[PDB]
Amino acid sequence: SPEQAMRERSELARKGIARAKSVVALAYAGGVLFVAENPSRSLQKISELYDRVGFAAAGKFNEFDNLRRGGIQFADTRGYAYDRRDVTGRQLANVYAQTLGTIFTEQAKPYEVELCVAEVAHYGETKRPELYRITYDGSIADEPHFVVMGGTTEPIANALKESYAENASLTDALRIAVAALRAGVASLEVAVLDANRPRRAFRRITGSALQALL
């Protein structure tokens, strides 16, 4: 029954992602901002992938951490086989798309995850941030302003949909992001792909320094 299985697996996945905490990523003046509901001190739902490329996920941790590692593996290998500047957010999204598509199809259980790959311009370069969302079945789509994943999204999506305004400051953006999440610091994981860093954009904003923003 190619049609029933497809539906069940798909349901099983959507449900898992639904019962998980929410994550949000949005474009902003200095880069991209990642904000996720994360109680744990040492478990990260947001991570650096390459020089200017970031990663964020929602769902089952062991499953998305697996994808995170694979992504890092792919990026480092490319950069080395060619050059660093040949690695791009589009390539990583494309890879995740193909990977999840395969898992969803040939693995025992679908991956209960939803991913977001983001990329900002290179230092001194001028380019519009890019955000990609890959879903448990390998579907891919690029959002122009923000991405929301995990749990009940609509409430966070709409809240942000009315809230958001590009070119916002880091703080106005951080606040808008948190509030949308609120619709649907010791409980927040925050990081940015900062377009002003010379090579490695990824940077965590934690502790007191996070407090001030908040």
């Binding site: 086989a81 060619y82 050059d83 660093r84 500047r85 040949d86 589009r90 390539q91």
Partner: protein, 222 residues
């Protein structure tokens, strides 16, 4: 064989001779040693002909393969690395007499200063590469003669034209001292080939242009 490459403001010119040898015997008089690899790159290879040709052909396919697959061209650094990998891969065979050394010339579209975008990269038998910073480079059995010639003539390279003219004179000097490098053949009308690359891309230089330069050089030394 002698293949030369020089930078001029806004671009590069690469030129090669046409001779092929089997010991002391001339086995070729019209070999083309300089290839347009992609829109902004040219490769010149010296050494064992079979291997040289295979390299240029495989290299171009690899570059275009990446472009079609990823939708954009490899960065210039990536191009260098791929070539370097290929050379490194042939080391065992090179030790056994299948040695071939490439010379890379290109225009980097992503470089900040366009008049300075020209690139010249040399390679050693182990795949070690070096981005030339002094303006010119050469490879092959007549490369020392060519380089020593360009050293005295380089100040004249003020544009792609005088660069093409200098390149041809360097090849001429190379053939004047290296029997394995072929000079301009006036009787048969065979001349070195050349590729020029600027912001508008890589282009083959018309044989008639090179022949004119060649005849002038000969008249000069006469």
């Amino acid at each position: 064989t002698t293949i030369v490459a020089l930078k001029y403001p806004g671009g590069v010119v690469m030129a090669g001779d046409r001779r092929s040898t089997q010991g002391n015997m001339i086995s070729g008089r019209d070999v083309r040693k300089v290839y347009i690899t992609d829109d902004y790159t040219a490769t010149g290879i010296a050494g064992t002909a079979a291997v040289a040709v295979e390299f240029a052909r495989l290299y171009a396919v690899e570059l275009e393969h990446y472009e079609k697959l990823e939708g954009v061209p490899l960065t210039f650094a990536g191009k260098i690395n791929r070539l370097a990998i290929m050379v490194r891969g042939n080391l065992a065979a090179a030790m056994q007499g299948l040695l071939a050394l490439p010379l890379l010339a290109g225009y980097d579209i992503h470089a900040s200063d366009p008049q300075s975008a020209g690139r010249i990269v040399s390679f050693d038998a182990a795949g070690g590469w070096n981005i030339e910073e002094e303006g010119y480079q050469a490879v092959g059995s007549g490369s020392l003669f060519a380089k020593s010639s360009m050293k005295k003539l380089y100040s004249q390279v003020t544009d792609g034209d005088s660069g093409l003219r200098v390149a041809v004179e360097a090849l001429y000097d190379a053939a004047d001292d290296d029997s394995a490098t072929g000079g301009p053949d006036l009787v048969r009308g065979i001349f070195p080939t050349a590729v020029i690359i600027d912001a508008d891309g890589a282009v083959d230089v018309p044989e008639s242009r090179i022949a004119e330069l060649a005849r002038a050089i000969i008249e000069s030394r006469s």
